Design a binder for this molecule. Structure first.
Ligand SMILES: [Cl-]
Ligand SMILES: [Cl-]
Ligand SMILES: [Cl-]
Ligand SMILES: [Cl-]
Ligand SMILES: [Cl-]
Lengths: 197, 198
């Protein structure tokens, strides 16, 4: 099973490409029973190296594979509108990458196991903008959130909501210092105004 | 009855109309003080219109009753302070405006020579207080506007912020809480004018 050739039909899946020893090896294409079609490099019956897989619904990945999963630098385009360009780790967004959301949001930062995780900045379509840490695809740890007004909160976050100590600075110049828990003010706080009189 | 001048042993002088041996009618009296009164008299008392000029500088011009300021009258002070309003037997009482030399000027109610009731005070530092007063001090519900453009409205006690109140800024974002002796106390809530996501 050497040279070029065509083969398979596990279902109706036809692989056509290079071969070694009954394993697909080299560049080749494979239209799978789904209708998904991978066209790239192979290493011993798994996609390994660069390759493009078109999904039947519309999706389209472009990048490096390893052991039949996305691994390395790769671009995932949702022709609905989404677009991701960055590092992968065995099928999941992992490392650094940017994502353009359909709703208008844009992310730039770290990822771990297909989730925003680590440092990253997200420019919301509504005008807010977050610059801080993440955990499990939600704002977690210290961060800075600017609001389309121009005022901002800087403090701690937990599970996507304001939580812990924090300061909120106003355009006016005034400040409120207090503690949050699950996105809500409670406890003793301090509020400084810009002008005394 | 009639007119004539008199020199008391005190050094005081009176000349003007008399009735039954009592100063009554128009007359002028310069006191041993150096104070000189010039107005209407009734039975040896300032009563009706009159001016009283003090040797130190002050000058009352208005109506008198039972030898005391009573009715509408203007008093200008040592410092330059000018009161224009109603009097009640020597005390600011009713409605009156006081313009202090420091620049502040008050316009509101009075009771027993004290700011008491509703009144507006424009501070010289650019501020304005519109609220109630008790015993010459900001007391009750009031609105305090800062030159900032923000404003505090809530309650006052003995001249300081005290009780529930709201600071509302130029943005429309507001802080809601309670005060004790002009300083923040208790738990508060801060609301933003504009926020994320909604
Ligand atoms: Cl989040
Ligand atoms: Cl939140
Ligand atoms: Cl501003
Ligand atoms: Cl006061
Ligand atoms: Cl105060």
């Amino acid at each position: 099973m050497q040279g070029w050739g065509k083969y398979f039909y596990a279902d109706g899946g036809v692989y056509e490409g290079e071969w070694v020893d009954g394993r697909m090896h080299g560049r080749g294409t494979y239209v799978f029973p789904n209708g998904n079609k991978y066209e790239g490099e192979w290493v011993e019956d798994r996609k390994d190296g660069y390759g493009i897989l078109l999904y039947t619904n519309g999706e389209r990945y472009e990048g490096y594979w390893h052991l039949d999963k996305a691994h390395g630098k790769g671009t995932l385009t949702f022709l609905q509108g989404d677009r991701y360009v960055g590092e992968w780790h065995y099928g999941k967004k992992h490392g650094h990458g940017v994502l353009s959301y359909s709703n208008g949001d844009t992310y730039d930062g770290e990822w771990r196991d297909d989730d925003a995780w680590g440092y990253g900045v997200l420019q919301y379509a509504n005008g807010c903008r977050y610059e801080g840490e993440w955990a499990e695809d939600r704002r977690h740890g210290k961060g800075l959130l600017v609001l389309p007004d121009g005022s901002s909160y800087e403090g701690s976050f937990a599970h996507g909501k304001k939580d812990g100590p924090g300061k909120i600075i106003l355009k006016d110049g005034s400040m409120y210092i207090g503690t949050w828990k699950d996105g809500v003010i409670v406890g003793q706080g301090e509020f400084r105004l810009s002008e005394n009189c």
